[PDB]
Symmetry: C2
Subunit: 230 residues, 2 copies
Amino acid sequence: MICSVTGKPVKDVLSTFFKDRNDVLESEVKKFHLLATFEECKALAADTARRMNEYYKDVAEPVTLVALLTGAYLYASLLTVHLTFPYTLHFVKVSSYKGTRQESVVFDEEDLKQLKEKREVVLIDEYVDSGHTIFSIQEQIKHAKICSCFVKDVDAIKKHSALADTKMFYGYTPMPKGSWLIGFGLDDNGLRRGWAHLFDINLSESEVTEFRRRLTEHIKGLNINGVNRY
Amino acid sequence: MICSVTGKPVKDVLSTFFKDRNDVLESEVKKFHLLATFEECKALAADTARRMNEYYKDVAEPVTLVALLTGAYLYASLLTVHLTFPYTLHFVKVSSYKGTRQESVVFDEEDLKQLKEKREVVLIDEYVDSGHTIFSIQEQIKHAKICSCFVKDVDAIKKHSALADTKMFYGYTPMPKGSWLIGFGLDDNGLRRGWAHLFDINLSESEVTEFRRRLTEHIKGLNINGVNRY
């Protein structure tokens, strides 16, 4: 029940967050369950930057970082400010086409053509849930690497022999089955992307309490002193 | 000599920033002149959020926020997390077409069609410089408002009778004549967007020192205590 970065009790984090807002009704406040405080998410992002920094410290050509619109903008902002190797960054819009046999990610033709030419390409997304997206991206850009703050189930991802070699830089895994996330850039039917804390709206209290028990323990064990230079 | 937010000597903010990086050569470090630390930029962004919160405190429908790729991603992340009224957010990758008579901003047809329907549209940019972009945007989306962390010369934009009514939310102005900004989301020929401090690469030390004198005076007078709930 306490922020693992600041030590502030979650009830106090939330009382501050919900004070006199104009984007939520008092009666709706209880529907939002905090899974991770913004500070905790920032720590995860910094830890991910640390690993990417070690991975690319000797790179001889700028890495191509590409973020998928629109939710990844926040995570991308929290990650990129801590990167210390050369890279270019751009955002692309994709579509999720649900076919009778599979769900495929549709890229703009030019965006796809460009990405396939780069040796080091890292696609950023704040949340890898079903993974159908990365299975599809991987088959279109075989050498693509993935970067995401949260990954629901890496093993599930690893199950696919095609994704077995795919390098993923992520902040934390696993995420709760049955959850529905909003905040931390993720929209609530278009709204609340700027609600910086990561909230869930579908889990039970015990599930949220258990997720946080595991998350705080993970964050308390991090060694990211110095990653943040600001 | 110090960060107007943290109180820490700029020399140390810079030493911490440049220690063991893999994205700049030692001989190149001196090319970057700090104009505003990341914390100072965050204060300016918090100030713009405060003003937008007051402006839209009673809005009856979600405000349409549109951020201009790529550079605006960082500022948008620093702005949106502090907004307390309802809004949707999306990014557009417009083109800057240089014609023989004028430079126009080319929007995707669908993006432009959608925006023209919303009563409240706010274009987000981390830096409004030549303004040619906003003269063009307002003639395509006349009711569009602008939100930019930094503005080269507000007095100049107003010159255009068409832009005279265009509401602008901005963090700070004016920027030094002849400056070229990199960092804070802005690229240095594609690189260093994640260098979170705002740097200039064209000015003399005396020019930079004078700018910081003015920026400091402005930030010391800011009243944003409480805008940040995180």
